[PDB]
Amino acid sequence: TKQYKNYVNGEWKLSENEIKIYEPASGAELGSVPAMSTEEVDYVYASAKKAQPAWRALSYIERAAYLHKVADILMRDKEKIGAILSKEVAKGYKSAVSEVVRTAEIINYAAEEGLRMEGEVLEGGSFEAASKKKIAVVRREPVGLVLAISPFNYPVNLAGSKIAPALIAGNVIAFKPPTQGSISGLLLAEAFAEAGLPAGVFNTITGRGSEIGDYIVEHQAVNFINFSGSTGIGERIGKMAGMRPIMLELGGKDSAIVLEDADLELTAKNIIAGAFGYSGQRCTAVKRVLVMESVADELVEKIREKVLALTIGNPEDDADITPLIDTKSADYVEGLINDANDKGATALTEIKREGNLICPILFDKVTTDMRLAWEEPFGPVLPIIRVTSVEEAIEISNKSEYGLQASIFTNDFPRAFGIAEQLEVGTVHINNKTQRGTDNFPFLGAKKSGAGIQGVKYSIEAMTTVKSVVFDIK
Amino acid sequence: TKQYKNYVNGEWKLSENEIKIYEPASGAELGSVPAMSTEEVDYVYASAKKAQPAWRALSYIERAAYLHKVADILMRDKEKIGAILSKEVAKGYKSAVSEVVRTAEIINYAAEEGLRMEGEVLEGGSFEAASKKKIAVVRREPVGLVLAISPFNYPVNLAGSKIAPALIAGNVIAFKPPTQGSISGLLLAEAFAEAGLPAGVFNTITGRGSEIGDYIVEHQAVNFINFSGSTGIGERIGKMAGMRPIMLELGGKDSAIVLEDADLELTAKNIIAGAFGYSGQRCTAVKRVLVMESVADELVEKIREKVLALTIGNPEDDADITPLIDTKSADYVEGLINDANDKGATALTEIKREGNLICPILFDKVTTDMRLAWEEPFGPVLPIIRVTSVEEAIEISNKSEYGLQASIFTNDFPRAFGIAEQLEVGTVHINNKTQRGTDNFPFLGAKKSGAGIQGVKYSIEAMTTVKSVVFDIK
Amino acid sequence: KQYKNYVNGEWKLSENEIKIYEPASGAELGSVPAMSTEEVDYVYASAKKAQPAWRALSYIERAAYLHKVADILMRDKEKIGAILSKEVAKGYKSAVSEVVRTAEIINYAAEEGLRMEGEVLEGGSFEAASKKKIAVVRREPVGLVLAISPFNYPVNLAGSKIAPALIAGNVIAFKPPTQGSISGLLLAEAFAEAGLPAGVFNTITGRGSEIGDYIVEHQAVNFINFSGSTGIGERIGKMAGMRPIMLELGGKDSAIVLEDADLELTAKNIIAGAFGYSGQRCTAVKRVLVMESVADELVEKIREKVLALTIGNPEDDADITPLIDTKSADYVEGLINDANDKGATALTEIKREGNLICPILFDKVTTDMRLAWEEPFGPVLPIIRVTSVEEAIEISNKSEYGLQASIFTNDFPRAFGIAEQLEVGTVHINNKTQRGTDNFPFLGAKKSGAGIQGVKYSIEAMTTVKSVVFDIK
Amino acid sequence: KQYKNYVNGEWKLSENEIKIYEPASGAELGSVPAMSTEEVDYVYASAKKAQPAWRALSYIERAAYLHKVADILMRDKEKIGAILSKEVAKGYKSAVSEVVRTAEIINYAAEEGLRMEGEVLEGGSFEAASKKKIAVVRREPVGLVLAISPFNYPVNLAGSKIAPALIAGNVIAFKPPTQGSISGLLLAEAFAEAGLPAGVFNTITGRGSEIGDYIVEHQAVNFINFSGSTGIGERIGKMAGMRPIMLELGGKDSAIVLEDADLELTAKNIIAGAFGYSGQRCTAVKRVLVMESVADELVEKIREKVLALTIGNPEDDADITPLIDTKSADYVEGLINDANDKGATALTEIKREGNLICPILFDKVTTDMRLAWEEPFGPVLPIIRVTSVEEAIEISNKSEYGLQASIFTNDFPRAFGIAEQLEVGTVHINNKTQRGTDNFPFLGAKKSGAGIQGVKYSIEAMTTVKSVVFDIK
Ligand SMILES: NC(=O)c1ccc[n+]([C@@H]2O[C@H](COP(=O)([O-])OP(=O)(O)OC[C@H]3O[C@@H](n4cnc5c(N)ncnc54)[C@H](OP(=O)(O)O)[C@@H]3O)[C@@H](O)[C@H]2O)c1
Ligand SMILES: NC(=O)c1ccc[n+]([C@@H]2O[C@H](COP(=O)([O-])OP(=O)(O)OC[C@H]3O[C@@H](n4cnc5c(N)ncnc54)[C@H](OP(=O)(O)O)[C@@H]3O)[C@@H](O)[C@H]2O)c1
Ligand SMILES: NC(=O)c1ccc[n+]([C@@H]2O[C@H](COP(=O)([O-])OP(=O)(O)OC[C@H]3O[C@@H](n4cnc5c(N)ncnc54)[C@H](OP(=O)(O)O)[C@@H]3O)[C@@H](O)[C@H]2O)c1
């Protein structure tokens, strides 16, 4: 199979050791990626630090052009990359091409968003008369070397969301894709190589996150860690980061609160699309329904039928439900199913597993006593929790240690907004499924779902500090 | 003994154990402060979390009103507080009173700055045509419970700079002052008590940071940690915070770069004032002069003469140089002085120590081979390092692990601005000593000097998060 | 009792004066000066002379002066209110409220203004070759600002211009309305006691029909901040030449009522918005556009609430007091007669006692009636029934006025979509229209005005920018 | 030969036409329609009809159209520049530069405008009782914008208005200068090929002397964005009424030279800023205010550098080219004559051949000479010797113009101090004046303009705000 290579200091490098990658759906070998040594990781960081000063010396418009070029290249090769991305993560071919497309759209937007960066002028006379002739010219500077780490489910899209914002501001990148998804990650790297950015400005790292994961995060050459993945790992990175700045996008368990005055048809469709997209292997997705009892039977009946219409199959055919990322992930999901079942939950759709392809399951009658009501499944299993008041839904919703997003289905806006203030999440969508949707929009999670505010504009702000030059006027 | 109490959930409290505080300049007992146990800490936090919701439900102008009363009380009692502060940390009485005035000003400014909290409306149609009718209404929200920790040299000033910005935003506070300075800390607490903020909104914690320090920081009730202290403790706080947000203000070794075309008389005064203020026990302060050989002889001669003009005595006499904070510090400072003398640097003043009162001393011909070239003394000792190029001055300056602020004395502004870009620090002052000065201005430190951007406005932004509510217009 | 203008630190009288009478009783209140052109010239010359030293002060210093003035107004709110109440026949308690509102706006403008910020723009954003070139952009004052207030809020709509103007470093020439000049000068007193530098703040009294055009045409004035009728507003638009202006003009705010509305909540908001100060409010519900199906219910509710309104003298705090003058009363009565005479259904008796007009509600008002379009400025409310939301938007936009609008309904997304279509500045959902919350932007479309007000915007409007560009080496 | 106007997606000629000739050669370039008032009415009627649907489009959709227009311009920069150069006798290479610059501004405005954001304000910021009330403020287009460019930059100063306008959701009615209308129609071609909806972008041609007032006074126009003489500008101010406007008028930029100035750097900048396009530029050094102790040395450097300036035809990219028309050169000659009679010294040959005047350097110019204040728009540079910085500022501010200023010194703190005092929009330290980098603000003080330009400010200027207020429950 093809031995992929990391892009280091303008050169493609193999490592003495490698990691073989297999297709989650077919099981066929896709290729191998390098299993870097600490020494090699040192070389990557040393290269990026050396290239930083000259990268920062360039003009904003110059750096923007480089990023636009990468986007253009990605668009040109969107089908070649999608073909392999689809295979590497058992993701539908079309959505795979979609991820590549969104990645280009984000890179472009971040490029133009970051070149308009401005500074401020503050008046000393605002705080004290004696200082009225003193002013502060405050401009933005990069934080230095940014370590970007993406997730298996969006190894490219959630790579660009970090890389472009970091680069437009004059930062340099060390990109570490998920092992399962590193080929797609290195394919993204090829685009940066061809755009011709100076050597060391963009570099990749590959190896098992469990073998060099800590080493790359603890390394003192790194000035900022931008991460997406499980909460468990996020916590660890939080500590290893020390006092250095970070950005974390972690686990989710988005609740969809359904009131009595909700358009039940619109709620059912939105929940279906949000809950079962990518077989529930999505971070920001409806993972629990908190519906007022008087409307529960009707809502559940609607959701049941819609689940039956979902297509089940191979990513090749763009099936709604494809095989899960791996065996363990599927075993884990079966565990949640067993627990809900043993404790009384009602499965309204067939419980079936063929390999790692689990059929879409609708669990009604789920209670706060079942694991499924709290733990993030990352499988096609949607639990329905019947409540008796808005107050109860909020309690249950906030009880979760997760707070990425929430949906409120109601026709009483003012109340919706009031409820929104109470929910401990980053974003609340009214009468719509949750979604990172519209990358210029802020994206964040409360509690253990993250740290920092994402969304293009915010990402750029997050990976820059300020340099204040003060002087008195004569 | 005069036993001071902590302010907890609207009440004053003592603990089974206490800590006696003495005057660093005389040994006289000032009183004692409680040495809280973990249970008492747990209660402070439980009381704060309970009061946070009702505090956040208030209007901005209401919270602003409460803060303005505190400020008025502080001004009214500036002579009272100043008197005790002066004795607790052996700081000049007049500067002590000035600290209180500075605290009130900051509280007033944070009240008005924060009540004008604004949000933003983003257009979905900015990213994709299909979401043109989708908008995002983003409003600021508090993070929750903020743990504020001040240093011994500005126990009140560096308390207000955290408390007020935090409170106006809807966060609740737990204020931990430094032990040597805890009486002044509880005096400040009095103002919040008399102002009548709801019980639990503001609370204090006293005890040895080496006995409960880690406990209060590690407690999972704390949502944010705002700290000013040594780099050592800061690094420690960065780790215990996990993935929780923090603000750190640490060690400094601000350099004063002096170019050949500088106004030597103006440069000497700024240097004398900046380096010897509060006997060098300041964080933002000229602690090393990097001066071009060409003008070094003349510059040094001016500084030498101004040093001998500095008054030395007790805090009640408003002396320039007063006894250091404690024996360990005087010992340490004496150690740095001796290492420079023994290594051959040129002492331009007599070496003299009486008790913990170290006479101001100037060293010329200091080399990078000397400890005094890098270590933060926190004593009246100023090293002069001669250089032969701006290039070298910049290298020596960036070589330090500290990067709080810096001073550039020159008449070539364009170049001064150019040099500023290269200096790894937060703020660069042209023709003026370094200073946090004008609290509306950003205040941050690079490398190991800190994390986060202070300055009233920035403090508020840092201690708030965002809540996005998205819906479609019909 | 003769009142004097405040000019260049001195209180000055003119030979010619103008007596002011209580609109409710007719009792003489006092007299205000009737300035000559030369006198006006001195006010302006004093201001221009003082502007440099005024601008040279720190922002915080200027804010302290304003905070002073405000504190003084709060202290004398009853004293000033008692006279304002009588000068424009406004409820005593609400007159005091105007004073407080004025103090609040002054304080708020003080703190909003000292936080004035600048920008640092990067040349490298536009072209590589200019990457070392930066622009430090700071805000500066325009110069001399001429503020003119209306009779209905002679003080409130004075401070809303003066404070924003001053904090930014401009100097003020304040022209209160003739009927309301005593309250204006009373305000002037607060500024005098505050001790602002001589010439920084000045007042001008005199009939707008005798000197109005002169004060505006004077080439010393750099900015005109006006509140009044559209007719005058439009004139100022022309006399201003190319100079910057801010105009707050006429309004005929509509209250669109949909079928899913809370009729009880809608009625109360409409009563409050329509009859406040006897309808002598610019931003106020002046026409209801309601879906037929719920028209009958809504109208019955509004009818009863109208009858519960108090009618009387300003000292008794009546809801409905005598209109500002006889000419206005005649106009309002003409609008009432035209509606009745054309077949509109009057749900309240028609009665005028002197210049006191009783609140009246007209139902079945057609676009054929004058009341459907002209700003009455009296206690008369027309109800126009429509059969669709589309028709309500058409009827609303058809007006030449577009200050604010109200939409009563439970369908928010639809309300937002309607707001976009409405040609107005602000749309309130399930609430009467209001300038309310002075930090909020306040503006009108079409013939309702020019420029965006509200503390923040007022300040931005009365300052320009100074860009200093240089290259870093 | 016969060019057509682009109206509502169609190219149309008018009953009458206007012939355009090459300023430098006199040859006929072609003709442009001479619209009748009725044809103007159709342009406005068409644009107002297509505005709603143009506004209904997403920001990114509108930005895409602008990008395409920009791309077409880059593709035809030579083709267009060749004709532009001849229409206004501008160097061929700099003519192509205008087109490029125009494309750059269009792309920048597209991306700047699509990122447009709104704001949410808290009622609880002003009063505790309105803490549940919030205002969702979003930006809306003003509607129909009339864009009018000058002869010297018919394409550049057209696109600087059109792009910021369109991205915001407004519709455009573009009126170029007669001498430059062909270029303008060439620009229109790019918009037609980009395929923007019909009526969104339209052009108007006709002598600004017959329809000039008609197009401005028309009530369909919501905003007028103009660049031209102070005279026509003052007039548009009045004809605008109370409608919003943007004016970029005349300038008499001063270059203040201090004793510590880098005289060689100073001189080079002055030569470049003063004689660019034969002085037919608005933002340009038009008067040197130099300290006496260094004048002789600076004047000598300037005198020599002037002699190195090329003089000839536009096709040869000559530094100095014929002036726009006969009257202009007559006017310049009038200035040179008054300067001579009054005593000034001409250090370079005074010569006129046709409408091509050789670069003239006048030294010993006093404030009594017309040349010291009047905008020449000819290759004539007056040097005014002062004996104190205080005087330089006085003389500089004495002018009725205040577009930009240059300060050549090395004492920055002081330069900044001088800058605050200079009554201009922008101050360049040690660099000739310039609209320099389009994201930077561009504005003029006093009679040099109205409104703040610069891409970002342009967009904000041609947009209003819509506030929807509701209470959270
Ligand atoms: N909120 C959001 O925006 C967001 C976005 C994406 C994902 N998520 C969450 O991410 C999870 C699914 O992603 P995943 O399975 O890929 O998560 P994961 O197992 O946490 O890994 C995420 C990334 O972390 C790397 N990693 C592992 N151990 C590390 C260590 N010690 N130090 C540094 N990096 C280390 C991984 O490398 P290897 O692949 O080599 O192990 C991978 O690139 C879900 O819980 C989902 O909700 C949330
Ligand atoms: N950049 C800035 O703005 C800034 C401002 C102020 C000070 N500083 C730096 O601070 C130093 C002087 O202050 P200092 O000597 O008082 O600092 P310090 O010893 O680090 O202590 C500062 C505060 O931290 C508390 N603390 C100690 N151990 C702790 C622990 N394990 N967990 C949580 N809190 C703990 C202390 O309590 P106890 O008093 O009970 O030990 C005290 O309140 C200098 O290095 C100076 O440069 C910098
Ligand atoms: N500050 C700046 O950015 C800037 C930029 C460019 C020019 N300028 C100034 O403009 C002047 C040179 O330009 P110019 O000679 O073309 O200016 P102009 O004579 O004032 O005319 C400018 C534009 O106005 C049109 N126009 C004429 N009469 C009009 C009327 N009654 N109503 C509406 N529009 C009318 C002209 O049409 P016709 O061609 O049909 O006459 C032309 O398109 C100088 O004073 C220069 O400083 C300033």
Closest CA to B470 of D446, D268, D120, C435: D120
- Please tell me the distance between residue A80's alpha carbon and the centre of ligand 1 in angstroms: 25
A3 touches chain B (CB under 8 A): no
Within D10-132, strands assigned E span 10-12, 17-21, 28-33, 118-122
Resolution in Å equals 2.5
D467 strand-pairing partners? C426, D137
Q: Is D370 exposed, middle or buried (0-12, 13-18, 19+ CB in 10 A)?
A: middle
- Number of CB pairs < 8 Å for A and D? 32
The answer to whether residues B126 and B60 belong to one domain is: yes
The answer to whether residues A174 and A51 belong to one domain is: yes
What is the distance in angstroms between the CA of the first residue and the CA of the last residue of chain B? 71
Contact A462, A245 (CB under 8 A): yes
The answer to whether residues C207 and C300 belong to one domain is: no
Closest CA to D446 of D393, D398, D395, D400: D400
Contact A383, A372 (CB under 8 A): yes
**Is B283 tagged catalytic?**
yes
The answer to whether residues A234 and A142 belong to one domain is: yes
Residue corresponding to tokens 């500590």: A239
All residues of chain A having their beta carbon less than 8 Å from the beta carbon of residue D115 are: 112-113, 116, 440
Domain encompassing residue A26:
1-250+450-473
The domain tally of chain A equals 2
Give me the residue from B116, B421, B474 closest to C112, CB to CB.
Answer: B116
Q: How far apart (Å, rounded) are the C-alpha atoms in residues D214 and B111?
A: 54
D420 touches chain A (CB under 8 A): yes
The answer to whether residues B122 and B244 belong to one domain is: yes
3-class state of residue A438 by DSSP: coil
The answer to whether residues C435 and C457 belong to one domain is: no
Query: Hey, are the CB atoms on A468 and B413 less than 8 Å from each other?
Result: no
Per-residue buried b or exposed e for D95-128, using 16+ beta carbons within 10 Å of the residue's own CB: bbebbebbbbbbbbbbbbbbbbbbbbbbbbbbbe
The answer to whether residues C113 and C194 belong to one domain is: yes
DSSP states of D197-251:
PTTTEEE--S-TTTTHHHHHH-TT--EEEEES-HHHHHHHHHHHTTS-EEEE---
Question: Least CA distance to A141: which residue of chain B?
Answer: B421
The answer to whether residues A106 and A91 belong to one domain is: yes
Closest CA to B387 of B282, B314, B291: B291
The answer to whether residues D295 and D235 belong to one domain is: no
Alpha helices by DSSP H, A228-360: 231-240, 264-276, 293-308, 327-342
Longest dimension (CA), chain B: 81
Q: Is C10 exposed, middle or buried (0-12, 13-18, 19+ CB in 10 A)?
A: exposed
D472 touches chain A (CB under 8 A): yes
* R_g of chain C computed on alpha carbons: 24
* R_g of chain A computed on alpha carbons: 24
Q: How far apart (Å, rounded) are the C-alpha atoms in residues D103 and D80?
A: 12
Closest CA to C219 of C51, C44, C47, C8: C44
Q: Please state the separation of Cα C472 from the chain's center in Å.
A: 47
Closest CA to B95 of B277, B276, B224, B272: B277
Closest CA to C215 of C5, C2, C458, C455: C5
Q: How far apart (Å, rounded) are the C-alpha atoms in residues B352 and C390?
A: 90
Smallest CA–CA distance, residue D446 to chain B, in Å, is 30
The answer to whether residues D239 and D388 belong to one domain is: no
Q: To 5 degrees, how large is the angle CA D224–CA D226–CA D231?
A: 115
The answer to whether residues C228 and C294 belong to one domain is: no
Which letter does DSSP use for residue C280 in this model? -
Query: Hey, are the CB atoms on B58 and D131 less than 8 Å from each other?
Result: yes
Question: Least CA distance to D142: which residue of chain C?
Answer: C445
Closest CA to C61 of C200, C247, C229: C200
- Please tell me the distance between residue C50's alpha carbon and the centre of ligand 1 in angstroms: 66
Q: How far apart (Å, rounded) are the C-alpha atoms in residues D122 and D115?
A: 23
Residue C74's CATH number: 3.40.605.10
Q: Please state the separation of Cα C319 from the chain's center in Å.
A: 20
Q: Give phi and psi for C258, each to the nearest 5.
A: -95, 165
B20 touches chain A (CB under 8 A): no
Per-residue buried b or exposed e for B267-292, using 16+ beta carbons within 10 Å of the residue's own CB: bbebbbbbbbbbbbbbbbbbbbbbbb
Residues 440-459, chain B, touching A (beta carbon < 8 A): 440-442, 444, 446, 450-451, 453
Query: Hey, are the CB atoms on C112 and B113 less than 8 Å from each other?
Result: no
Closest Cα to atom 8 of ligand 1:
A229
Which letter does DSSP use for residue C315 in this model? G
What is the distance in angstroms between the CA of the first residue and the CA of the last residue of chain C? 68
A120 touches chain C (CB under 8 A): yes
Per-residue buried b or exposed e for C341-359, using 16+ beta carbons within 10 Å of the residue's own CB: eeebeebbeeebeebbbbb
Q: Is B151 in the pocket of ligand 2 (CB under 6 A)?
A: yes
Report the C-alpha dihedral over residues A285, A288, A291, A293, rounded to 10 degrees: 160
Which residues lie below 8 Å from residue D56, measured CB to CB, with a gap of 6+?
A: none
Note the residue count of chain A. 474
Q: Please state the separation of Cα B204 from the chain's center in Å.
A: 18
Contact D145, D462 (CB under 8 A): yes
Q: How far apart (Å, rounded) are the C-alpha atoms in residues A295 and A189?
A: 50
Give me the residue from C416, C417, C473 closest to B415, CB to CB.
Answer: C473
C122 strand-pairing partners? C134
Query: Hey, are the CB atoms on C416 and B116 less than 8 Å from each other?
Result: no
Q: Is B209 in the pocket of ligand 2 (CB under 6 A)?
A: yes
Asked how this structure was determined, the answer is X-ray
Which letter does DSSP use for residue B371 in this model? G
**Of all atoms in ligand 2, which is nearest to the CA of residue B454?**
3
Q: Give phi and psi for A295, each to the nearest 5.
A: -120, 5
Which letter does DSSP use for residue C199 in this model? T
Which residues lie below 8 Å from residue B246, measured CB to CB, with a gap of 6+?
A: A243, B224, B225, B226, B227, B237, B238, B451, B452
Contact B396, B385 (CB under 8 A): yes
The answer to whether residues B456 and B428 belong to one domain is: no
- Please tell me the distance between residue A449's alpha carbon and the centre of ligand 1 in angstroms: 12
Which residues lie below 8 Å from residue B240, measured CB to CB, with a gap of 6+?
A: B214, B217, B218
Closest CA to A441 of B134, B144, B16: B134
Tokens of D155: 């394409």
DSSP states of C373-430:
TS---SSEEEEEEESSHHHHHHHHHHSSEESEEEEE-S-HHHHHHHHHHS-SSEEEES
Is the backbone of residue D56 left (phi > 0), alpha (psi -120 to 50) or beta? Answer: alpha
**B115 half-sphere exposure, CB direction, 13 A CA radius:** 27
Q: How many CB atoms lie within 10 A of CB B331?
A: 14
Q: How far apart (Å, rounded) are the C-alpha atoms in residues B119 and D234?
A: 39
Pocket test for ligand 3, best of D101, D211, D232, D426 (most atoms within 8 A of CB): D232
Closest CA to C82 of C315, C311, C318, C310: C315
Q: Give phi and psi for D58, each to the nearest 5.
A: -80, 160
Pocket test for ligand 1, best of A91, A149, A218 (most atoms within 8 A of CB): A149
Residue C364's CATH number: 3.40.309.10
Contact C452, C461 (CB under 8 A): yes
Give me the residue from D114, D119, D134 closest to B120, CB to CB.
Answer: D119
Within C201-348, strands assigned E span 201-203, 223-227, 245-248, 254-257, 287-291, 345-346
Tokens of B420: 């500023």
Smallest CA–CA distance, residue B410 to chain C, in Å, is 14
